[PDB]
Amino acid sequence: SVKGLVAVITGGASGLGLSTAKRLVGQGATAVLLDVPNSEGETEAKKLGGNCIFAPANVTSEKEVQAALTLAKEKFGRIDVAVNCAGIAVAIKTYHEKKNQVHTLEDFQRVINVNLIGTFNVIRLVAGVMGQNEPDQGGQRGVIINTASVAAFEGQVGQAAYSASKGGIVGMTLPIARDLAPIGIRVVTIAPGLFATPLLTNFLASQVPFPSRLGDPAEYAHLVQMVIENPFLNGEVIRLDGAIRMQP
Amino acid sequence: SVKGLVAVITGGASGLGLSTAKRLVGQGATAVLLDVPNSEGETEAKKLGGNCIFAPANVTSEKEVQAALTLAKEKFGRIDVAVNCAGIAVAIKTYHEKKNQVHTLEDFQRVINVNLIGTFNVIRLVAGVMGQNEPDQGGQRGVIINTASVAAFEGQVGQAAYSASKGGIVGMTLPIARDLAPIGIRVVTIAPGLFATPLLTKVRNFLASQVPFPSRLGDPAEYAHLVQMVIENPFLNGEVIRLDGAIRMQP
Amino acid sequence: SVKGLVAVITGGASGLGLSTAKRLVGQGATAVLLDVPNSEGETEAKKLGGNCIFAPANVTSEKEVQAALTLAKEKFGRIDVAVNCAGIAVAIKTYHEKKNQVHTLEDFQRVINVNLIGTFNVIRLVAGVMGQNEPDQGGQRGVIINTASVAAFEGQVGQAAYSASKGGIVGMTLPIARDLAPIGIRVVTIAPGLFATPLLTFLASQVPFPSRLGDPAEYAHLVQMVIENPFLNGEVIRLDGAIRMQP
Amino acid sequence: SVKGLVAVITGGASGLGLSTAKRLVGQGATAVLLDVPNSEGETEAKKLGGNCIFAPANVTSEKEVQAALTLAKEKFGRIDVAVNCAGIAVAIKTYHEKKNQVHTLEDFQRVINVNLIGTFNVIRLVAGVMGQNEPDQGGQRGVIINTASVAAFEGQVGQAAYSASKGGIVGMTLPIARDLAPIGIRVVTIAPGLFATPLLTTLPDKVRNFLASQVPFPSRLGDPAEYAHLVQMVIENPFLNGEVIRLDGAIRMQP
Ligand SMILES: NC(=O)c1ccc[n+]([C@@H]2O[C@H](COP(=O)([O-])OP(=O)(O)OC[C@H]3O[C@@H](n4cnc5c(N)ncnc54)[C@H](O)[C@@H]3O)[C@@H](O)[C@H]2O)c1
Numbered sequence A: 001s002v003k004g005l006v007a008v009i010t011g012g013a014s015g016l017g018l019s020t021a022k023r024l025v026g027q028g029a030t031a032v033l034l035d036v037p038n039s040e041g042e043t044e045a046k047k048l049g050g051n052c053i054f055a056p057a058n059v060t061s062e063k064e065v066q067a068a069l070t071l072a073k074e075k076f077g078r079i080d081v082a083v084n085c086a087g088i089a090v091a092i093k094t095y096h097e098k099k100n101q102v103h104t105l106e107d108f109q110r111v112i113n114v115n116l117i118g119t120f121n122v123i124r125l126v127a128g129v130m131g132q133n134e135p136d137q138g139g140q141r142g143v144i145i146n147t148a149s150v151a152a153f154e155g156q157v158g159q160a161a162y163s164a165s166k167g168g169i170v171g172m173t174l175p176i177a178r179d180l181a182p183i184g185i186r187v188v189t190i191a192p193g194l195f196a197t198p199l200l201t202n203f204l205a206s207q208v209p210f211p212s213r214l215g216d217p218a219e220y221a222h223l224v225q226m227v228i229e230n231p232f233l234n235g236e237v238i239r240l241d242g243a244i245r246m247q248p
Numbered sequence B: 001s002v003k004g005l006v007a008v009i010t011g012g013a014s015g016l017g018l019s020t021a022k023r024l025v026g027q028g029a030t031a032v033l034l035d036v037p038n039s040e041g042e043t044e045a046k047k048l049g050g051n052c053i054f055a056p057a058n059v060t061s062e063k064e065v066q067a068a069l070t071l072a073k074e075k076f077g078r079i080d081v082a083v084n085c086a087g088i089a090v091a092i093k094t095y096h097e098k099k100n101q102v103h104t105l106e107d108f109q110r111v112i113n114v115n116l117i118g119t120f121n122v123i124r125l126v127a128g129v130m131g132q133n134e135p136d137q138g139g140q141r142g143v144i145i146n147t148a149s150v151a152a153f154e155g156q157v158g159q160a161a162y163s164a165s166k167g168g169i170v171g172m173t174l175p176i177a178r179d180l181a182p183i184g185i186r187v188v189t190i191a192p193g194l195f196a197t198p199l200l201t202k203v204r205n206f207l208a209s210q211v212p213f214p215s216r217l218g219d220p221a222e223y224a225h226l227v228q229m230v231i232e233n234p235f236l237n238g239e240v241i242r243l244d245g246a247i248r249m250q251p
Numbered sequence C: 001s002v003k004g005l006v007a008v009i010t011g012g013a014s015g016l017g018l019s020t021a022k023r024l025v026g027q028g029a030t031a032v033l034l035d036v037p038n039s040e041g042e043t044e045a046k047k048l049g050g051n052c053i054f055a056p057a058n059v060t061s062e063k064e065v066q067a068a069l070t071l072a073k074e075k076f077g078r079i080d081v082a083v084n085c086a087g088i089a090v091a092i093k094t095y096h097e098k099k100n101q102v103h104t105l106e107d108f109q110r111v112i113n114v115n116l117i118g119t120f121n122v123i124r125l126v127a128g129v130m131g132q133n134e135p136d137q138g139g140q141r142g143v144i145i146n147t148a149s150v151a152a153f154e155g156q157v158g159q160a161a162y163s164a165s166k167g168g169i170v171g172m173t174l175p176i177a178r179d180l181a182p183i184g185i186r187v188v189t190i191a192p193g194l195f196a197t198p199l200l201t202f203l204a205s206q207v208p209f210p211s212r213l214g215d216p217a218e219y220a221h222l223v224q225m226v227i228e229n230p231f232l233n234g235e236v237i238r239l240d241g242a243i244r245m246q247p
Numbered sequence D: 001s002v003k004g005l006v007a008v009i010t011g012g013a014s015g016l017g018l019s020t021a022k023r024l025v026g027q028g029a030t031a032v033l034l035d036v037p038n039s040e041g042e043t044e045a046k047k048l049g050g051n052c053i054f055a056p057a058n059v060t061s062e063k064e065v066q067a068a069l070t071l072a073k074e075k076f077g078r079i080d081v082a083v084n085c086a087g088i089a090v091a092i093k094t095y096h097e098k099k100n101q102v103h104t105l106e107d108f109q110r111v112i113n114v115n116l117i118g119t120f121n122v123i124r125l126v127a128g129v130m131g132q133n134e135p136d137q138g139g140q141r142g143v144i145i146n147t148a149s150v151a152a153f154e155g156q157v158g159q160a161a162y163s164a165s166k167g168g169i170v171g172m173t174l175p176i177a178r179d180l181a182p183i184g185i186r187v188v189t190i191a192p193g194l195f196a197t198p199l200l201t202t203l204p205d206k207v208r209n210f211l212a213s214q215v216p217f218p219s220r221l222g223d224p225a226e227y228a229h230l231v232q233m234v235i236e237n238p239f240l241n242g243e244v245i246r247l248d249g250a251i252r253m254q255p
């Protein structure tokens, strides 16, 4: 079970991070929603009660994310779980002939900065916080769960920046679990296929073999709970995608 | 929840299949252990209670497999889940220079027949049974879970036959989930690393000294919780999951 | 250069294996085409001249492959390379709901026996032949090249038996290269996408670029590069124009 | 044959990039070495002769890469091949328990910026230059080859930034090949295991000397010329695309 664990969930005001937060608070854990100030984190935290607060922060900022973890530890006393769901996406070709338009450097930089350098910023700063915990009966001090994408394996036309960023998450999964193994922190990544969140904001659903529909955010939340409960899952990437494989 | 579902677990008399049956029965499901007659199957299904029975069958036998699935459908009315855990292992080099010995073809064939063809034999026969189920609210008629190994990806010296059989399992997982998509049967494969079973249990704790964290052999109850997650989560399909403590196997 | 080398190519009377044999003989190597007695192996070997012979053998047969390897080692003096291209395909659903048809166990067993058990049978018995060679200046005594398929990774509807056999090839590539490391035999597998051969001849249209079936001479070119590069080992290479298969 | 093709090779003053230049120019091609100003660039470009020039440039700069490409296009008339070998490595734990030291954010940012954003900078700006060429008999306009690493799959302890940069190169290889398919530009990535280049001084020392033993066969560090031979194979084979090839002796990295 996850009752009594404290989880910091980035991207927690919407979509997969918010559904994760609803499932873990409903199972008895406490959840901090780390999300930008312009989001609706504060209200969603209120709707989930006193065991779920909002920590406004941008994950590309060291000082903000350090302030958000300080808040979580001060309120709830420790951090057991982190879930990285903050992320953005763009759909721009590397070079579009017709328009003779190269993809800009700054649009690639921005997607790398939020998705991959923002996930590594959270990881590096929560790892020292979970390192303070007394190890449980099996030597574990924490679990860190990241969100990649099937775009890390079958990135479509227009997804070079998003793919680069999520393949970076996938490539650092095993070296960060091997770095944190001596202090008992597992590191696992989930790679969702196509899910019903805002991030889509009209024919995507038909491509999915079975179930033949977009994923429900609550199914990502149930895998997150399984990942936190299973003590031997480590250093691995799970696809959650209805058996889809993306075409160009 | 798995309360009420009927699962047939091949390899259910020992190790990972037996720990899966104990967890699923302790959570309210029914379980049929499918394992060879010599095994401890009968005893185990007795110690597990009236919601678990033993169906003697060798998975390389179409007739025996089909008889066990029919027993299950007779006793319990339907089959909702199948978990393939029957398997064998050998440690024989392709060519051993000290000995001057070449791996026999029959010792490769044997591993391939139990591990690979025997999992396909159970899959193909249980798909037609699950296809008799009424689809649930979300279109689902059944879930098939196979057990490969990390050896499908990092086979060590000595594991050509075992690696070939487990890579065959991994390679057929997506085309079988695509074949079954129209009738709502999910197909997922779990690839354990090293586990404390009557396959493993100085030769063994050297192996457990290589696991990053937790630093020890897997406990079969951890494989059984992964199998419960895979039954419960409706969107996991056509994928292979490593369950191994972050180990990568050296030669 | 592959000049001088002796290769045994299973499935060499047709498609990929024959194009590979044309290229390697054209570059000065010797080739032994290992194929079933009913194929056109004798004529194909005759057309390539006296540096190319036919050794009729089914790769599932331990007696037949040992006699064809022995013919190669006697005729040419040694075996430096083995290319596994012998292979068959089927298109059968696991369970077909409209006809209420279960895939038969025999059709799955026959594809695994030719493609997977046959490729291991050639590897296991050519290894000890190559083990007789004096190592070259970098320790090498031989190179073994197997043929899998993109179906090991994106198997389509109807390909459960073929994907199982090609996923078995990929799976065993690294342990046999580990096994053979002490005697200097490299082991590499190619996973082609779709190639214009008698196994095949809108599939073409799905390949990003170039948008067409592959040409068997491009597979032959990638085989020569794997024979020439001393550091490629224990790896599977996709040769597929960037195709990813849909159901 | 590579004869008469024009190749721009980033990181071309040393290691893999230089040995790749040496091989292509030995085989009849022209090569531009794109490397920083403080490297041996200019002297290598001289030793390699009249069909090899140095364009000093940092791959992280739009302006410098655009200028180096323009010089190649002005001086040889076209660009047929691009080879990304510019790269840096670091060995830093995400969080060090003994020393109680966290990996800095700017050290991870610097390796992602050189290795991954610097490789996409060159791709996107060379793509349009290759797109000026007329298509060959088979529809091809150019080939782009990138260098990742087996760290993209088995990153060791200390390699979080390096692995994240290299796994990002692997992750983008297919979407870029798909993006560039209409114009006939293949995109392939090579993931080298451990090679005898000057980069090697990144490992402990009590690590480095031992490396060879881990390599199954041949049981040694890779020779840079072996990397160069695989690059020529990728240039020549018209059907390789969208794929990553390990070149590593069958090694699998332990922690
Ligand atoms: N929905 C899908 O189909 C899908 C598929 C695959 C992967 N993903 C990944 O799932 C994760 C969650 O996305 P989602 O679908 O829930 O979308 P979402 O847009 O609903 O939620 C993303 C949340 O991340 C927050 N966020 C963005 N930038 C941030 C920053 N710099 N700092 C802090 N918060 C920031 C947003 O404000 C938002 O509340 C993302 O990493 C996305 O890439 C989503």
Ligand SMILES: NC(=O)c1ccc[n+]([C@@H]2O[C@H](COP(=O)([O-])OP(=O)(O)OC[C@H]3O[C@@H](n4cnc5c(N)ncnc54)[C@H](O)[C@@H]3O)[C@@H](O)[C@H]2O)c1
Pocket: B010, B011, B012, B013, B014, B015, B016, B017, B034, B035, B036, B039, B057, B058, B059, B060, B084, B085, B086, B087, B088, B089, B114, B118, B147, B148, B149, B150, B191, B192, B193, B194, B195, B196, B197, B198, B199, B200
């Ligand atoms: N234990 C590990 O470290 C480990 C690691 C990876 C994968 N695995 C895989 O896990 C699965 C379960 O193995 P385990 O460790 O529990 O071993 P186990 O020996 O304890 O259990 C295997 C069961 O399979 C049954 N079996 C063997 N051949 C059979 C046949 N033809 N027909 C029916 N039953 C047959 C055996 O009688 C035994 O009861 C196997 O597929 C094995 O390859 C195990």
Ligand SMILES: NC(=O)c1ccc[n+]([C@@H]2O[C@H](COP(=O)([O-])OP(=O)(O)OC[C@H]3O[C@@H](n4cnc5c(N)ncnc54)[C@H](O)[C@@H]3O)[C@@H](O)[C@H]2O)c1
Pocket: C010, C011, C012, C013, C014, C015, C016, C017, C034, C035, C036, C039, C057, C058, C059, C060, C084, C085, C086, C087, C088, C089, C114, C118, C147, C148, C149, C150, C191, C192, C193, C194, C195, C196, C197, C198, C199, C200
């Ligand atoms: N052509 C494609 O699109 C494609 C794609 C991926 C993989 N492949 C694989 O490439 C390989 C080459 O096939 P191809 O396309 O050249 O087909 P092909 O039919 O033209 O040739 C295969 C050769 O194998 C021989 N062979 C079959 N069974 C044999 C047996 N038991 N013993 C000895 N020889 C036997 C056949 O007689 C034939 O001459 C096979 O392994 C195939 O599975 C082909």
Ligand SMILES: NC(=O)c1ccc[n+]([C@@H]2O[C@H](COP(=O)([O-])OP(=O)(O)OC[C@H]3O[C@@H](n4cnc5c(N)ncnc54)[C@H](O)[C@@H]3O)[C@@H](O)[C@H]2O)c1
Pocket: D010, D011, D012, D013, D014, D015, D016, D017, D034, D035, D036, D039, D057, D058, D059, D060, D084, D085, D086, D087, D088, D089, D114, D118, D147, D148, D149, D150, D191, D192, D193, D194, D195, D196, D197, D198, D199, D200
């Ligand atoms: N040597 C190995 O074992 C090894 C293994 C795997 C991958 N790699 C990768 O191989 C590629 C080549 O490395 P190498 O071993 O030749 O190392 P190297 O240090 O000898 O050469 C790399 C070159 O890249 C140049 N470079 C660095 N940053 C640059 C920048 N911002 N702009 C332009 N040039 C820049 C350096 O000046 C150097 O000349 C790198 O991407 C490296 O990560 C090397």
Ligand SMILES: C[C@]12CC[C@@H]3c4ccc(O)cc4CC[C@H]3C1CC[C@H]2O
Pocket: A089, A090, A091, A149, A151, A162, A193, A194, A195, A199, A200, A204
């Ligand atoms: C950015 C995503 C992949 C690219 C997708 C796309 C890309 C192009 C397009 O026209 C529509 C869509 C809809 C859903 C998008 C996405 C939601 C899931 C995600 O990862």
